Design an enzyme around this catalytic site. Structure first.
Site, PDB file in Angstrom:
ATOM      1  N   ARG A 105       0.797  -1.231   0.000  1.00 48.04           N
ATOM      2  CA  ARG A 105       0.000   0.000   0.000  1.00 48.04           C
ATOM      3  C   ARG A 105       0.832   1.284   0.000  1.00 48.04           C
ATOM      4  O   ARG A 105       1.637   1.504   0.917  1.00 48.04           O
ATOM      5  CB  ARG A 105      -0.943   0.064   1.208  1.00 48.04           C
ATOM      6  CG  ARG A 105      -1.815   1.331   1.196  1.00 48.04           C
ATOM      7  CD  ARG A 105      -2.580   1.575   2.473  1.00 48.04           C
ATOM      8  NE  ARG A 105      -3.117   2.934   2.495  1.00 48.04           N
ATOM      9  CZ  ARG A 105      -4.327   3.288   2.067  1.00 48.04           C
ATOM     10  NH1 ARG A 105      -5.166   2.388   1.561  1.00 48.04           N
ATOM     11  NH2 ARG A 105      -4.709   4.553   2.169  1.00 48.04           N
TER      12      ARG A 105
ATOM     13  N   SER B  61      -7.504  -0.037   2.098  1.00 46.56           N
ATOM     14  CA  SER B  61      -7.219  -0.803   0.884  1.00 46.56           C
ATOM     15  C   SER B  61      -5.746  -1.150   0.679  1.00 46.56           C
ATOM     16  O   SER B  61      -4.875  -0.449   1.180  1.00 46.56           O
ATOM     17  CB  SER B  61      -7.732  -0.023  -0.322  1.00 46.56           C
ATOM     18  OG  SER B  61      -7.821  -0.847  -1.462  1.00 46.56           O
TER      19      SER B  61
ATOM     20  N   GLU C 174      -8.667  -3.544 -10.718  1.00 50.50           N
ATOM     21  CA  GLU C 174      -7.628  -3.211  -9.734  1.00 50.50           C
ATOM     22  C   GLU C 174      -7.176  -4.337  -8.779  1.00 50.50           C
ATOM     23  O   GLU C 174      -5.997  -4.419  -8.431  1.00 50.50           O
ATOM     24  CB  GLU C 174      -8.057  -1.994  -8.917  1.00 50.50           C
ATOM     25  CG  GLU C 174      -8.096  -0.697  -9.708  1.00 50.50           C
ATOM     26  CD  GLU C 174      -8.911   0.398  -9.021  1.00 50.50           C
ATOM     27  OE1 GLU C 174      -9.469   0.144  -7.930  1.00 50.50           O
ATOM     28  OE2 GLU C 174      -9.011   1.514  -9.584  1.00 50.50           O
TER      29      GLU C 174
ATOM     30  N   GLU D 151      -8.252  -5.242  -5.280  1.00 53.02           N
ATOM     31  CA  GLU D 151      -7.916  -4.777  -3.942  1.00 53.02           C
ATOM     32  C   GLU D 151      -8.225  -5.802  -2.862  1.00 53.02           C
ATOM     33  O   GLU D 151      -9.166  -6.576  -2.973  1.00 53.02           O
ATOM     34  CB  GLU D 151      -8.694  -3.506  -3.608  1.00 53.02           C
ATOM     35  CG  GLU D 151      -8.608  -2.414  -4.643  1.00 53.02           C
ATOM     36  CD  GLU D 151      -9.429  -1.192  -4.275  1.00 53.02           C
ATOM     37  OE1 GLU D 151     -10.165  -1.223  -3.265  1.00 53.02           O
ATOM     38  OE2 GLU D 151      -9.341  -0.187  -5.004  1.00 53.02           O
TER      39      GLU D 151
END
Ligand SMILES: OC[C@H]1O[C@@H](O[C@H]2[C@H](O)[C@@H](O)[C@H](O)O[C@@H]2CO)[C@H](O)[C@@H](O)[C@H]1O
Ligand SMILES: OC[C@H]1O[C@@H](O[C@H]2[C@H](O)[C@@H](O)[C@H](O)O[C@@H]2CO)[C@H](O)[C@@H](O)[C@H]1O
Ligand SMILES: OC[C@H]1O[C@@H](O[C@H]2[C@H](O)[C@@H](O)[C@H](O)O[C@@H]2CO)[C@H](O)[C@@H](O)[C@H]1O
Ligand SMILES: OC[C@H]1O[C@@H](O[C@H]2[C@H](O)[C@@H](O)[C@H](O)O[C@@H]2CO)[C@H](O)[C@@H](O)[C@H]1O
Ligand SMILES: OC[C@H]1O[C@@H](O[C@H]2[C@H](O)[C@@H](O)[C@H](O)O[C@@H]2CO)[C@H](O)[C@@H](O)[C@H]1O
Lengths: 226, 103, 103, 103, 103, 103
Positions: A4, A58, A107, A109
């Site tokens: 992250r 996230s 994406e 996540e």
């Protein structure tokens, strides 16, 4: 490991006890009551931050993806970091729980319910002018033995925490149907979803306190004391 | 027996209840002769002590004094919020008689 | 009774306050005959000991010495910041009389 | 008075310093009669014990032996690295006399 | 010997099993004379005490009352769920005889 | 002295090695008279007890028993894997003699 990009520096993260969701000061602060809601979290986007509202922080499944998101959101930052996180049951793969209703599919996540405790962060890389400093700084308080063997929470356990709105067709279908909170598919639904997510978090937080607080437990010589 | 800290506190003379509802700001431990005690403070300014064992203590309180010091140390280290303190106010700093915490 | 570590430190002869504001760098413990003590060190190079219990110690101090050693072990293992130390400077290494931690 | 484990170790006969610089691999504890001891091992193959209290041990050492066992258990659980060991080599496994850790 | 807390509980008069399956809500510790005890409560509204050591306790229970208080303190701090409690219901608050935890 | 739990176990009669390689599932602690003991169980179904001090225990074991109970509580709370157990199988539940953990 999950990754992250974040503007918040290592010592701030330490002061907070982890990577917190929007509006949560310290990790163990039951003081402000957070709204935990996966679907709502999965749809919102933040300025200067990779998705972290609605009680979930996230994370990307790779350094590159984490880098890409950072570059796009944190485009003009002399310095920002990319945290390397161990997998554990507080993590939910957003695509697996929300299924075909996943707002930002491609994406990929994986979100942490309630944030990410400091002791679950393996380390971090510093990113200077958008360029990654390949030197992985190790977090000394990472619980290696504990996290060593843990995994993301399987999708089955997340369905009832999906937080789709009450009249959202998903509650009226497989597999969310078998896991819909009391009142989903009135406000009972909402308060029920929030109650279940908060239970799940409080239980995970206890697993964490059992790890970190035991370090302070000092044994007594009862025969000398008595 | 008493069921709360307020109720237990009321059966002693010279005591009073402080609602702290906050973690310990500082912890001081001393092994200096005749000053073997612990002192704690809060960000509100309050300072309290666990007294050096003396004649004002019956035998059964000795193991309890040791237990209290163990409790305050770990409570400080874990940054655990203290709810209330029952203290004897005829000592400066006020002397801790009981403590309570809630989750 | 004292309200801070400084005030308590000043009640003795041959003491001094060391402002540390740092975690312990190394911890040494020994169970060797006649040298059952603990030695701690800091980045600054300063070295302190918790003396072997002896004649210089009154019976009340004996329990406080064991407690101090427990506290130092915990502080070392958790990298907890130590604020100040009150030491007797007439020993080599300087002997620990009291410790304070903050925040 | 010793300032380091090495200096402390040199004061005794039949001792040796082992530079471990690693976490304990395994921890064994026994309460079996006449075998109340702790045994630890390292990845490198080194095995050490904390001896059953005996006549070779003086009064002051009795408490110190219990502390060392407490130290080895917590050190194992927290995966803390041990820097050096000062051990008596006239025993098998070698007997722990002192321990040091850093950072 | 018993294999479960229920089995152990039924061996005494005036006892009963309480299925809590919940973390401790509040923890209260007193070092006040003749009231050296701990009191715990649950969200359910149930209150329990570890009694003050007295004449109803045989010698062997003395070291166990102490251990129990240590367990309750750490169980509270870590928010660990208590499964069942075996209590003597001839006391107010009911007095703790045994505790069990799972997972 | 023994160098492993297996070697140590072999020195006694009525013992047996159990390879657990799992964390403790439940922990039960009792302060009831004549039953001051701890019982632990594993997912596999095994149940073991640290037994009540008695005539079958030598003096050196009194402290060792308290240590074992401290160990079982902390290993339960931290969810640490137990590698092997050496138990006396002439008791029900089997009595713990030694424990080993490795990571
Ligand atoms: O026990 C600690 C507490 O003692 C108080 O003194 C009591 C004492 O315990 C009691 O036995 C006797 O009758 O005198 C006092 C009555 O109030 C101290 O007053 C208090 O400050 C603490 O030190
Ligand atoms: O208490 C440790 C401390 O002892 C000093 O000697 C004092 C001691 O304070 C007191 O308890 C004893 O009864 O009398 C002695 C009078 O000088 C040492 O000077 C100091 O270095 C520490 O060792
Ligand atoms: O104290 C443990 C240490 O003792 C050695 O034995 C000493 C003993 O301590 C002392 O009383 C005597 O005067 O000399 C003995 C010989 O050195 C053991 O040899 C050593 O292995 C440890 O067990
Ligand atoms: O052991 C704590 C427990 O004591 C009970 O009293 C028992 C006592 O254990 C026994 O020694 C005595 O002879 O008989 C009593 C019952 O017949 C208390 O009644 C109980 O509430 C606890 O305090
Ligand atoms: O030490 C606990 C262990 O004791 C055995 O009993 C033995 C004792 O250990 C030894 O001193 C001697 O042989 O006398 C006793 C006779 O059986 C128990 O059999 C075992 O189950 C444990 O209780």
């Amino acid at each position: 490991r999950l990754y992250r990009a974040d503007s918040r520096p290592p010592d701030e993260i330490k002061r907070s006890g982890g990577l917190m969701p929007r509006g949560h000061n310290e990790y163990f602060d039951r003081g402000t009551q957070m709204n935990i809601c996966l679907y709502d979290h999965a749809r919102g986007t933040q300025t200067g931050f990779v998705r972290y509202d609605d009680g979930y922080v996230s994370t990307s499944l790779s350094l590159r993806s984490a880098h890409l998101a950072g570059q796009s959101i944190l485009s003009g930052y002399s310095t920002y970091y990319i945290y390397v996180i161990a997998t554990a049951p507080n993590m939910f793969n957003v695509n697996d729980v929300l299924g075909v209703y996943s707002p930002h599919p491609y994406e990929q996540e994986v979100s942490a319910l309630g944030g990410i405790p400091y002791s679950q962060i393996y380390g971090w890389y510093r990113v200077n002018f958008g360029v990654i400093d390949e030197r992985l700084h190790r977090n000394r308080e990472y619980r290696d033995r504990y996290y060593r063997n843990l995994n993301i929470a399987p999708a089955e356990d997340g369905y009832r925490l999906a937080c789709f709105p009450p009249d959202h067709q998903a509650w009226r279908e497989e597999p969310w149907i078998h896991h819909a909170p009391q009142g989903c598919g009135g406000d009972t639904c909402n308060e029920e979803t929030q109650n279940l997510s908060t239970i799940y978090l409080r239980e995970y937080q206890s697993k964490v306190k059992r790890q970190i607080f035991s370090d302070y437990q000092s044994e007594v010589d009862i025969y000398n004391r008595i | 027996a008493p069921q709360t800290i307020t109720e237990l506190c009321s059966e002693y003379r010279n005591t009073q209840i402080y609602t702290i509802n906050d973690k310990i700001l500082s912890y001081t431990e001393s092994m200096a002769g005749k000053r073997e005690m612990v002192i704690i403070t809060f960000k509100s300014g309050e300072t309290f002590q666990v007294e050096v064992p003396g004649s004002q203590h019956i035998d059964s309180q000795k193991k309890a004094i040791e237990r209290m010091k163990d409790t305050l140390r770990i409570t400080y280290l874990t940054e655990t919020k203290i709810d209330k303190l029952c203290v004897w106010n005829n000592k400066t700093p006020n002397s801790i008689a009981a403590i309570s915490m809630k989750n």
